[PDB]
Design a binder for these strands. Structure first.
Ligand SMILES: [Mg+2]
Ligand SMILES: [Zn+2]
Lengths: 57, 119, 241, 49
RNA sequence: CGUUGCCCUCGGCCGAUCGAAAGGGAGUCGGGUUCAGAUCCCCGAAUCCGGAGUGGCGGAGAUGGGCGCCGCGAGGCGUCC
RNA sequence: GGGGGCGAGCCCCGAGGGGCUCUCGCUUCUGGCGCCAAGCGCCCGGCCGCGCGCCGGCCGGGCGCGACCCGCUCCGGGGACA
């Protein structure tokens, strides 16, 4: 609906009950989620390989 | 020992005072010339308005073109111990702001008309 | 125990491309307004350009112990202020028709103020010590004065602060300040000061007249030039010697 | 871009002082694609775009 | 509780301003009525925007669960989250 | 200019370490997130308990480090020629 109608409407209408809801699609949410988790996981892994390389030297 | 965070240098916000004038410029303030009276010039007694009186519970007036609807509703109201529902202006092709003035149901329009002088 | 285990560290990295820099002081790189930026990069020009000796001679300013000593002496002969002046009149008017009015009494001695007063009393040799300010705003006012002093055999010195010179007398600034007379009780003092001034100014006036004083670069330049020299030294010093 | 036989490319960095996502417009190197990182600086790796 | 005075604190913008009765731009429709006006007057149905203090009212928030007594039992109180 | 040190080149070295030279100011597998301080350190106001209160508790604040020091042109690039 035309934008200056959202003034009227009830919240519920305008968004959706999820994270990120009403801004972004669910598909791209469920790929942030698992991306970010998969990123950080490597950072942790690399931090471990760094720490082992410090202890070795 | 107070650092400069951001590289800009905005004008420093100063003090600035209210006027404490040593004398008032115009001696007395002006008296308004758009009173309960001279806002409303006179009624219309035109077949139109006389039909509009009996039928629509209105009056009709010619008004000073400087008037709002707010001014007419409170001008009328003062002069005729009357309570208005809704004022409704137009400007005649002439220089006259003609207000149509609906009166609130409890008061009649024909009655008041006779009271003021028209009919 | 005291201790919660919740409290972590959570330490930020201010790297590059890393958790965003903290708001460090930036005075160095502030874009100042025109009036500031100018007033700085005058001081540079003074430092950077070749300043001729007779504008430099005002850099050699009096050193702390001495100037304070000087101002301790002056404080005696700070000229009669407002009110005081009225009080001196009022007492004279009463005494005229009451109990013998002589009239002139004996007027005491004081400091002398503006260049023009001084400069008559440096041609005259009325003064025994002149004090000039270093930071007089349009210099031309006070350029000759040291060269004039030294000719007339007048001890002269350059105080820091045309203001604090001007606070002897009771005005915003003053370029000059001159003692014509002093009381016998404060005589010796003046003379102990004068002699130490003329050792410092008059008596070496040739050196001062010769001595220019700008022509010093941005340290940013200098430190590059010295680096090149340390490169030129290591090319021909550690090899042979 | 109209009036231009290149394409341009909206390239988004992050601002390293303010928390803010600044964006630029580069002239596209041929063989750029979207969701492609664009490193840049003295220590930028020598690859395209 | 307001209102203001001062002090601190925070605050990028981006150019004052003007420029569309066809671009953008919330929200009115049915019937009736005049010699000449009607999405504007009358009747009747609506609607947006702005305001709402002392908050005008409901409803949401939120009225659980544990233990300990007393009570035939519905339950009542004590005390914990 | 120093600190810092994972380290590399050199010099010293008593193998603990120190100095000079480089190095970084520490981010490259993913269409993610990233600001308004955690951490330590030192101070004070009120209230409470021990009572010797810069002892202990409860509430509420301030500074420093964290985010080295000093500086004369914001940064470059021309430039006594344009
Ligand atoms: Mg406009
Ligand atoms: Zn998507």
């Amino acid at each position: 609906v035309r934008p200056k109608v959202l003034m009227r409407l009830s919240k519920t209408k305008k968004h959706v009950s999820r994270a990120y809801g009403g801004s972004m699609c669910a598909k791209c949410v469920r790929d942030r989620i698992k991306r970010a988790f998969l990123i950080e996981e490597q950072k942790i892994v690399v931090k471990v390989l760094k720490a082992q390389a410090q202890s070795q030297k | 020992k107070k650092i400069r965070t951001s590289p800009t240098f905005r004008r420093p916000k100063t003090l600035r005072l209210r006027r404490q004038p040593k004398y008032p410029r115009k001696s007395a303030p002006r008296r308004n010339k758009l009173d309960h009276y001279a806002i409303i010039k006179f009624p219309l007694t035109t077949e139109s308005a006389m039909k509009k009186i009996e039928d629509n519970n209105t009056l009709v007036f010619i008004v000073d073109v400087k008037a709002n609807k707010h001014q007419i509703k409170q001008a009328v109201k003062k002069l005729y111990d009357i309570d208005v529902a809704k004022v409704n202006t137009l400007i005649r092709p002439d220089g006259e702001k003609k207000a149509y003035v609906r009166l609130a149901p409890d008061y009649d329009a024909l009655d008041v008309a006779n009271k003021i002088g028209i009919i | 125990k005291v201790v919660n285990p919740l409290f972590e560290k959570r330490p930020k990295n201010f790297g590059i491309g890393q958790d965003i820099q903290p708001k460090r002081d930036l005075t160095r790189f502030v874009k100042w307004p025109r009036y500031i930026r100018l007033q700085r990069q005058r001081a540079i020009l003074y430092k950077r350009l070749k300043v001729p000796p007779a504008i430099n001679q005002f850099t050699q300013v009096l050193d702390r112990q001495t100037a304070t000593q000087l101002l301790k002496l002056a404080h005696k002969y700070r000229p009669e202020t407002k009110q005081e002046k009225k009080q001196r009149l009022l007492a004279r008017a009463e005494k005229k028709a009451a109990g013998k009015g002589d009239v002139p009494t004996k007027r005491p001695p004081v400091l002398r103020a503006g260049v023009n007063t001084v400069t008559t009393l440096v041609e005259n040799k009325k003064a025994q010590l002149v004090v000039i300010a270093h930071d007089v705003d349009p210099i031309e006012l006070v350029v000759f004065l040291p060269a004039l002093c030294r000719k007339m055999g007048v001890p002269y010195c350059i105080l820091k602060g045309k203001a604090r010179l001007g606070r002897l007398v009771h005005r915003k600034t003053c370029t000059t300040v001159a003692f014509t007379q002093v009381n016998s009780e404060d005589k010796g003092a003046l003379a102990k000061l004068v002699e130490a001034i003329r050792t410092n100014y008059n008596d070496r006036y040739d050196e001062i007249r010769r001595h220019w004083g700008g022509n010093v670069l941005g340290p940013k330049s200098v430190a590059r030039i010295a680096k090149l020299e340390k490169a030129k030294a290591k090319e021909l010093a550690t090899k042979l010697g | 871009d109209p009036g231009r036989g290149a394409p341009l490319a909206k390239v988004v960095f992050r601002d390293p002082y303010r928390f803010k996502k600044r964006t630029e417009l580069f002239i596209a190197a041929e063989g750029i694609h979207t969701g492609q990182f664009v490193y840049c600086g003295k220590k930028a790796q020598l690859n395209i775009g």
